[PDB]
A paper describes a structure:
We recently found that the ClC-3, ClC-4 and ClC-5 clade of endosomal CLC transporters requires the accessory β-subunit TMEM9, which we refer to as T9A or its closely related homolog TMEM9B (T9B) for proper activity in cells and animals. Each ClC-3 protomer comprises a cytosolic N-terminal domain (NTD), a transmembrane domain (TMD) and a cytosolic domain (CD).
Despite being coexpressed with T9A, we did not observe any densities corresponding to the T9A protomers in the fourth class, possibly because of T9A dissociation during purification.
Author numbering:
A (entry chain A), B (entry chain B): 78 to 174, 187 to 479, 495 to 737, 745 to 810
The structure:
Amino acid sequence: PIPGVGTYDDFHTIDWVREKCKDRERHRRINSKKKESAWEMTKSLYDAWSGWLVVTLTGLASGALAGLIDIAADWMTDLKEGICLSALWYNHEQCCWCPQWKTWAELIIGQAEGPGSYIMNYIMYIFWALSFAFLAVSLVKVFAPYACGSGIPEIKTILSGFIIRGYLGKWTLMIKTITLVLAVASGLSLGKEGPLVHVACCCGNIFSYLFPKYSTNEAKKREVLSAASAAGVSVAFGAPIGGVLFSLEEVSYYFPLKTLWRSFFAALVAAFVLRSINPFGNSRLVLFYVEYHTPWYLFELFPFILLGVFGGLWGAFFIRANIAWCRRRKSTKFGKYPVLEVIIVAAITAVIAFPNPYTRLNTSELIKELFTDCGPLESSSLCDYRNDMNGVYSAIWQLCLALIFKIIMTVFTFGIKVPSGLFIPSMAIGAIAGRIVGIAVEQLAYYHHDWFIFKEWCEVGADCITPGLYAMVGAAACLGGVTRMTVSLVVIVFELTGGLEYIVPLMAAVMTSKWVGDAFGREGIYEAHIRLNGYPFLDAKEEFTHTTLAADVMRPRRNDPPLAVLTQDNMTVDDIENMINETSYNGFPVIMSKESQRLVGFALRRDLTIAIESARKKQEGIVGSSRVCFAQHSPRPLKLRSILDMSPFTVTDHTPMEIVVDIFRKLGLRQCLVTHNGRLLGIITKKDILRHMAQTANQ
Amino acid sequence: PIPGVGTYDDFHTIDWVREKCKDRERHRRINSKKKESAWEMTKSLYDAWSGWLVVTLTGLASGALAGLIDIAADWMTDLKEGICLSALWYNHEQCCWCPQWKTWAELIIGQAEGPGSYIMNYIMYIFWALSFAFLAVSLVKVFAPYACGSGIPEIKTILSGFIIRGYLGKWTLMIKTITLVLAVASGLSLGKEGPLVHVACCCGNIFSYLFPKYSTNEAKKREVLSAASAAGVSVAFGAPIGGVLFSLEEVSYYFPLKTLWRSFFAALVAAFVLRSINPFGNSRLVLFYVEYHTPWYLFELFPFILLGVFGGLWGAFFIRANIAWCRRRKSTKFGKYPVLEVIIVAAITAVIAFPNPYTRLNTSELIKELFTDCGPLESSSLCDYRNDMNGVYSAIWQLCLALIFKIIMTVFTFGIKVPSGLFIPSMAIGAIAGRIVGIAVEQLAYYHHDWFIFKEWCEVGADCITPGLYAMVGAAACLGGVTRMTVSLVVIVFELTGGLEYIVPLMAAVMTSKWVGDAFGREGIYEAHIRLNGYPFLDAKEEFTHTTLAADVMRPRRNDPPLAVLTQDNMTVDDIENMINETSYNGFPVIMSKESQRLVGFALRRDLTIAIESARKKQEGIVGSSRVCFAQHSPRPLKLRSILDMSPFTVTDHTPMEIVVDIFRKLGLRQCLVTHNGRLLGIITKKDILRHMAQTANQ
Ligand SMILES: CC(C)CCC[C@@H](C)[C@H]1CC[C@H]2[C@@H]3CC=C4C[C@@H](O)CC[C@]4(C)[C@H]3CC[C@]12C
Ligand SMILES: CC(C)CCC[C@@H](C)[C@H]1CC[C@H]2[C@@H]3CC=C4C[C@@H](O)CC[C@]4(C)[C@H]3CC[C@]12C
Ligand SMILES: CC(C)CCC[C@@H](C)[C@H]1CC[C@H]2[C@@H]3CC=C4C[C@@H](O)CC[C@]4(C)[C@H]3CC[C@]12C
Ligand SMILES: CC(C)CCC[C@@H](C)[C@H]1CC[C@H]2[C@@H]3CC=C4C[C@@H](O)CC[C@]4(C)[C@H]3CC[C@]12C
Ligand SMILES: [Cl-]
Ligand SMILES: [Cl-]
Ligand SMILES: [Cl-]
Ligand SMILES: [Cl-]
């Protein structure tokens, strides 16, 4: 057809059936081309390998970017505490891997220990946090506004067919890559693991621009984006299987069979890239590499389930809190000052985090410490009480304070105009809760070994209880409660920790949290953010009442004027242009005759206008007076049959709306023409269905 | 409607849309019921938990049955070599865990070592193999003919909507459980891992009857069956994640999001049940628990890729060979003697297996030995050469003979009328090939360490090459080549071996095999067997030519007589009964009037006859003369509007058949009514689509 036909405007959903049709047509054209010449055969071979090439490129880019982001974030976070003068590039761990590393008090005051030294370290920590937060927020605001947030909700919307031009562009990729490091260094209650999914998706789109097959077709690009998201999760947690599971379960609306293996290969490639730079570019959580000698016991499930509950409860709170706060940001005036809000939040976070050791420590390092088990070699404060008796109260008090601080700050941190992730904060909260619960259980076992359960399961005076396992279970429970992921979450946690023996516990806790979350609402944080942003997302959970019928959702209805229709013949180009300008319809039905109202096809408004303009430019005399004939082949009438869709999806008025919604979800229909007695009556658009579902939810 | 309405006959596909509609109606009824009484609330709570209960029951039963089958198979297989008189229940390993265990030569001849002892052991081995094979085949033939084969192809067909009454019944479960042990003990080239999926599916189907929700609805039962298949794979390989991946990728036509977590929970429950009885009921492959000290090196990929190629090639051969042989069994007279064929095949297998040590050893134990690495503690013959220099030729010769014997015997073993699995033979062939390749690579490294690759990657005089990893890679490659599974296979292998370091190699090899297999055909062994059996399976790969249109596939066509249709009114019950008897159509369209040909609905033949008979019994005077009115409410006309489907799926004649196939696959439509100019013209049934695809394939 005319060039530009089939293209989609910004902020508009795609029609998956049409995309598959163009993909099939292009495949047929290439199949016929091969026989023509050997160069055509080579081009077809390249096209067949285009999927492998694009997924490999996306995985390589995701791994490299994840490594660079990890290294830069670690160095910048260590920069707050001090500086390694001997090796400026080296961070605190590398500097001491110490006299070379000097705290800011040593740099300025000259005294490593003292009230003035502590005060100066406090001010410098706050100043560095503020500087990093301000730089991040300014960079997002100036260059790439889309770089803010995790991006998982927008990726979910896009993979459902939605289009957000510039979200996965080069500008967003670069700005998000820099701002993730800046925000993580700032000490805000956020993580970079989730946003790596968006980073990988941006890389995948950029590489898809290279291959004509994926660039031309939106559905193919969305499969590439699903593979990219799998690779992003893999690099985030070193969980390629977990990444594939997340892609299938969370972000991929449609997950064909081949896309599974493509995503797995991309994730493995990205993980291998990270491993090649190991351990420089691998987060210490990704390199947890720790095991618990004592196998988990059946009675320990009861605490784990409890943790599960807590997780769910916390999620039920967080989804209710953050959303509300976010809604206020969208409704109140404080959302008009993103830079000021970010700076203030960073200031409060640093101010309350510096006094407490756990909060001051970087969140990923705190999660690592909590997951690590206690032992004679370990000198962590958490184990001090175990060394003292076998102060527990002081450690528990500090851990509870850190838990409360993290819980309160994550609500006000998620949603701000900087790249923020919820995975790391949720894992930290759950890990602190699990560490507290495990410490309590160990103390109960040691003090009350006379109990038959403790005596039978654990030998008298034996450290059967491992706080690290409890912390891992709590982190998984909190993540399940907030995100509502069930299997992908468990596999990701297992791959991050490497402990298969603890698969059964984790799952259990996760499920409990999920169920508890479902008690207060079946919508996850990502889904809630999708709804808050107003994106056109249709989900399987959403459903219509049985009484609802297609006639109810028909666009023309009663109050609205008669729906715009196009006669096949006897219509001028000026008439089509006037109809295009008058109405904002995604497309117009085309009928045999005005009186007959017999559906002939459905011509997209964009395609109609593009074809009319291209014909005007190509052929002289088309001043709008010439007629347009949608039928198959002086006036020189314009032919618009090519743009016309000859087999639009048709449903009856008496059809239940549940079947219509199922058709829309399975086939990804942009619109469906409701016809009565063989004649056109109305159109039900995905926008209309989404509007009706939103109205039902608001009720 | 009338009782029995909506039920499906045997060997008939189900309509997923209708199943979902009845599920929604039942859910609405229960939702309204809860408010009526507290007992209704408790019933609704039970119904909501019915999925968890059914999946838990399926997992428990699958784990218990897998453990029992493993124990019985191990004991029976050891029975062939000899007997433990001191403890008859104990097998060879348990007896020596030796003087207590006595070979049949000791029992009869009285001499443990001697030419007569070897001869007698040979005869007793053959006799036990024949006895077990005869008992297995007779048990399948007499009680449960469906117990034969792996059952994965039939489960694939069933999960696509097909109905095979009795396949998942109690008789099949019991007979298959006994016959799997009998066949595995017989020494035939088959495994019990794959068939365990069918066992789990039978357990799930049996348990579904307890819960009304799953028993009443076929689609719900099929989700339970998907969870059951995941649990079966989990027990087979101790790979719950691999089990879920297999369920999603191989057997589940539709995999809703909730079914993912349900399958994961069922698999974990079954694996935990196996672990509780550990190590008695766990196959030694499931308890491989072995690691390779030397990490895999990049150059070792080149052998692995080579192994991949071999795998694919072997698969391409096997699918072409076995199918052909299987086809001969269906076409020739030797398929009329299943007992004789089974006995003869067992005789040849035992005769050629006894002389060679690897073949005589049980296939699972041979796979374990091949996967295990060589070391000073190990006394295996495979490592003898390594001890001698560091006879290799003798070990390689024996391994090659075992490879050829297994490859030839698996072709004639798969498809016989006994429970047989392809997973274990495929892994055995691949493991033997990988062990040979790894031995060759190690010998090259030791002899030619001067090579820059070997010297750089491996220190001079260092055993960097690990034959166990090569054997694992070869097993994965062969399994990928024959089954064509990509991600589930890799995850299953990883969980079976427990080595996450070797995910990248495995995948690589698997990929190569798949690609190589795709060079000789894109249909796997299960798909090829589905096609051979003639089951009505529609796959995404199958597609129609662009020129094909709905009118081409319309049932009435030209030569065929006018399609049967039912007038809404003015028709007698005798007329409907006569139409039912005359035609074998799944259902009849109902129209406003004969002349108008305006589609009103679609009434299933089964529903029509059931409603007519039930009305005749319920109401007197219905002797066939009374008229039937399909319209909404002395003659006392019968009302058949309830059975009538008021919103049948309708498509246009000029529609491309590719869109029709996509609609059928996504929505699982039993039939689609092709209407032209608002009037009914024909029907395209899933049977018609499958027939057209089969015709295209035959060409
Ligand atoms: C267009 C995009 C996909 C290209 C991205 C290429 C990236 C992944 C490349 C560029 C430079 C590469 C690195 C260059 C050097 C080394 C040192 C070597 O001992 C291990 C691999 C390692 C660490 C490479 C890893 C992969 C790497 C980071
Ligand atoms: C926002 C981020 C990217 C900016 C990072 C810049 C950092 C590394 C810069 C900014 C200010 C710098 C310090 C400024 C002054 C001095 C005193 C000198 O005698 C030693 C180096 C030292 C202590 C510098 C170390 C590096 C430093 C901390
Ligand atoms: C209706 C179906 C699902 C019920 C199946 C129940 C099965 C799974 C039950 C019945 C008997 C049970 C066993 C009974 C005793 C023991 C010993 C204990 O130290 C470990 C668990 C173990 C080994 C149990 C495992 C589970 C088991 C095998
Ligand atoms: C098909 C399968 C299930 C049948 C299993 C039955 C097996 C275990 C039976 C059949 C024949 C039996 C043997 C027959 C005779 C004797 C001699 C006696 O002095 C010791 C026991 C011994 C050696 C028996 C051991 C058990 C035995 C091997
Ligand atoms: Cl994160
Ligand atoms: Cl996130
Ligand atoms: Cl098997
Ligand atoms: Cl099998």
